[PDB]
Amino acid sequence: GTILIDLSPDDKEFQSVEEEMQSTVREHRDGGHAGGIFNRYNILKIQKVCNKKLWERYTHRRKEVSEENHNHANERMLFHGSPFVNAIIHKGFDERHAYIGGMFGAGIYFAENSSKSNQYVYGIGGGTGCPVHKDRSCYICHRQLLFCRVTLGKSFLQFSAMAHSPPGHHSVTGRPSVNGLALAEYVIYRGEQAYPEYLITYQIMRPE
């Protein structure tokens, strides 16, 4: 029951999603190995993801979290990149979208930096890059990210360079403790704590 509504580039909603995408690009310590070398994107399309059942699944869990945390869902908008973006927008997040080997355990990972999620578009560590050219830095092939509504609730703060949340918590925050420019990354351990609200289709752009 998923439908995708195209946003117009003239729509304020397109513009504010694009701005979060572009303004949260940063350099990565791999020099571009996983995600490619770029400072910015060419945004090709932004679609709103509409699925009543998945939305209601999300809001149900959100109310549960909120009631366990002084009526505060601690809701954020966060990026997710995955080879499984098409399964996600149709069937929702679940345990098959978890990063089993992630540093905060087997859960579903999200980033404030769009460029961090870009590193997973073609798999962990960028996999073998784009299907057509086997290039992790492909400037031709169309990529997709999700910009998601995520319920964090009471988040366990991990300072740092499916499983369950830590007891008494609804999520984990990976707080960057070395790279002064990196934004936070977050993990949830229940697929119902995220809704894939925008599907963004883009290319990374070769620096001039």
Ligand X SMILES: COC(=O)c1ccc(-c2nc3ccccc3c(=O)[nH]2)cc1
Q: Which of 110, 189, 195, 202 lies at the binding interface for ligand X (CB under 6 A)? A: 110
Give the Å distances, CA to CA, from 37 to 33, 73, 93. Answer: 8, 36, 29
191, burial (CB in 10 Å: exposed 0-12, middle 13-18, buried 19+): buried
Tokens of 39: 């400072």
Instruction: Look at residue 114 and give its three-state secondary structure.
Output: helix
Binding site annotation covers 50? no
> Looking only at residues 100 through 139 of this chain, which bind Zn ion when binding is defined by CB under 5 A?
130, 132-133, 138
Number of residues that bind ligand X (CB under 6 A): 16
CA dist., res. 95 & res. 117, Å (int) = 18
Instruction: Tell me the C-alpha distance between 83 and 203, whole Å.
Output: 16
- Name the segment binding Zn ion (CB under 5 A); options: 22-30, 57-65, 103-111, 141-149: 141-149
What type of residue is 8? S
User: In this chain, which stretch among 18-26, 29-37, 65-73, 74-82 interacts with ligand X, using CB under 6 A?
Assistant: 74-82
- Residue closer to ligand X (CB basis): 68 or 127: 127
Say if residues 119 and 157 touch (Cβ distance below 8 Å): no
- Least separation in angstroms between residue 166's CB and ligand X is 18
Tally Cβ neighbours within 10 Å of residue 193: 28
For position 28 contacting ligand X by CB under 6 A, the verdict is no
Three-state DSSP class for residue 2: coil
The 88-107 site mask, x for binding ligand X (CB under 6 A), equals ---------xxx--------
Residue whose CB is less far from Zn ion, 96 or 142: 142
| Distance of alpha carbon 35 from alpha carbon 127, whole angstroms | 10
Q: Which stretch binds ligand X (CB under 6 A): 10-18, 23-31, 112-120, 158-166?
A: 112-120
Distance CA 69, CA 78 (A): 20
Query: Annotation-wise, does 141 bind a ligand?
Result: yes
Query: Where do contacts with Zn ion occur on this chain (CB under 5 A)?
Result: 130, 132-133, 138, 140-141
Binding residues for Zn(2+): 130, 133, 138, 141
Binding site for ligand X (CB under 6 A): 79-82, 84, 97-99, 109-111, 116-117, 120, 124, 185
